Nucleic acid binder design. Sequence first.
RNA 1: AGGCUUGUAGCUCAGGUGGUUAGAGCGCACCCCUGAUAAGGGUGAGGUCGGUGGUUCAAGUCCACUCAGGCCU
Lengths: 313, 314, 101
Amino acid sequence: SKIFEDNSLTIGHTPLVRLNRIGNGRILAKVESRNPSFSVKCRIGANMIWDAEKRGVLKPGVELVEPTSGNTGIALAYVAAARGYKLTLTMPETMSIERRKLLKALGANLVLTEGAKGMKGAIQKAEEIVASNPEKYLLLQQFSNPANPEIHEKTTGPEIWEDTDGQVDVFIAGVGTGGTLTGVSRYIKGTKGKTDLISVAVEPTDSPVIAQALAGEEIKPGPHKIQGIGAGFIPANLDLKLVDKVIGITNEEAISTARRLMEEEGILAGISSGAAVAAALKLQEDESFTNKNIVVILPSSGERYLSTALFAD
Amino acid sequence: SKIFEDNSLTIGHTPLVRLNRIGNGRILAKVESRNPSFSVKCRIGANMIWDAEKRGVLKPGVELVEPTSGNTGIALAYVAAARGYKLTLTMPETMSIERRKLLKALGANLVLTEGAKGMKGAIQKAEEIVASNPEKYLLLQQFSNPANPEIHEKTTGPEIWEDTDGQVDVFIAGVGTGGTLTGVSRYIKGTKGKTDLISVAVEPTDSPVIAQALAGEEIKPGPHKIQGIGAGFIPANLDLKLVDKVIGITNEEAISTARRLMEEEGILAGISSGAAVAAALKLQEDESFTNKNIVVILPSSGERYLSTALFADL
Amino acid sequence: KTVDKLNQKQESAIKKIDNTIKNALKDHDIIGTLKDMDGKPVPKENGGYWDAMQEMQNTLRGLRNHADTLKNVNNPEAQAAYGRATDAINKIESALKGYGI
RNA sequence: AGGCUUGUAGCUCAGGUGGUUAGAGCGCACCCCUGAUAAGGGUGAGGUCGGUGGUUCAAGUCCACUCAGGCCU
Ligand SMILES: [Mg+2]
Ligand SMILES: [Mg+2]
């Protein structure tokens, strides 16, 4: 007897699928595209609005504003539609007409900012929209809100621990906001008490800011094709005391691993998914990780990215 | 402790969500878009291959042929990629570039017929490929294979019955192949023994084939836009004994109800999902259905229908 | 305070900064880099696709090389060229930071 | 014979007190860019710093002698 009241409550319980033809048969893939807007972002777009309801700041009459150009907009769109709220998403003019049709047909009010300014133009437009009337709008701040890692501390951590039966030894996840890695690492290492877990972050080789942050070097980003990860800085959700290893992945091996994962596994996967699986592969080329159970996070599906360069001919 | 062996075993267990702003609060949606290739067909594309493995006809060294390009082709593609078999999909050449990229990315072989004949040419080309070398090829035959209602009797029916705690009253399902309606109507009326269930069938008004078959008329189909349902004939998999009502839904009602469902409940829906919810709303106009639990199947999302007439608000 | 006079290395760095800002820090190149990051690139005139992402990585690596050529110099014109290169790097990074998430 | 002054990448050349080994312009190879040319950027190959010694913690740079070229002679 389980009838969900709205579609925001249907998050989680994603399958953990053993990859048989990629690697040695010990890479385990947690398919996060089995979410109601088909991303890993559905967790945080539900929990940030739930936390805003619980701390009393989101009332009837308070609208939601967020600068985003990725899957967080789709997540906030379906949760604002399911729970009866309003949403204005600020984003640059560069992004496609298909993402705009999906976000407008799901209920959002798109504010298209100037494309040469780009992402901080979107952020500044969201900030003046909020500061015109601060008791009417609400800013979620996905790179600093602790709902973003506590949803992963309270949902996907126990799912990995109850699917692996506690036999997880290497956890591998890409870092866009850093909430997934810190939530899973905090649940396994602190709450349940397995301090031997190797938390590995996946990063682009064209913007390796986590490695530059761990080494002590200057943080200095660049452009890359692995979309979803590689923010260009160290967000407040990312906790570098939980990161035991970082692996950089180039764009072409990420795309080729996504195409391998589709063609040999049947899992529809994006570029970040292939990047994380390729990090698992070039970690398994070391001999000490031959008989380790490796759990890897596959955030999105490749059908979301169908008109892009993941599909050549 | 559940580690799945491949992605074909992850089918089912799709959530049952209440509609709050459509109807009176007694429409219950079965969102079948939360399957591993995001459709209702993931169940049947896994089960027909499992059944062909168990019957012994799908040996190692056997290729699969099916004349389709819709959700069933994507389902057969991901199951044949997960389990390790070869698939040859036959489709007319008027099909979009992006669906062909999605099918080539899953490792399928696309044999293209001409655009003059269309689906009959795709079926004839599939039959010629299987008749070339029958010990290597195998048709799955989605319209006449009992694995198609077998999977909905063994998975979907128990899910609806265990989530509603035995309180279903009306079951709306759109009939493209007649498998989900036959399976759930065969589990609830047959196994659990609830004959009070009203199983209605959604078809287009441009192709009212089930109504012409139940009224004893001549089958004359027509072109329509609600893709997924309205095959143009009565398949060998839909049994007409379990169909109580037939509700005809026009194209505009399906588009508008799918848009309404996306922007009022956050459920990413396609044209058939809007047709089924529109049939539930057309059935709640009568006074006897105002306090009956309605379970409605939502089989696809608006990701696939992104270049169609469903998204025309720019 | 002993103000210095430039080498040919620092004058080469200043001319590189100015030409790189004039020819590669256009609005069209930032549009093209953001189009490359979210998949779909801008096509050729005869078949194929352009590559603005490699060009922007080259532009960033050049501006950083000429910025860290010019830190501890005391000529004011060298400091103004360092400021121009720092502003172009901040313009690109503020166009790219947080995009795609 | 004396007094002076040159020699550094394929060519023309700067090198501030002895401190990244060593740099610029043109020339060469590869990539992006201009439909293309000019304009413009990135990576690299390329250096007994005329030769032999001395001094210094440290020599292209400071000394001592030679090799080759320019001025009064
Ligand atoms: Mg340009
Ligand atoms: Mg010379």
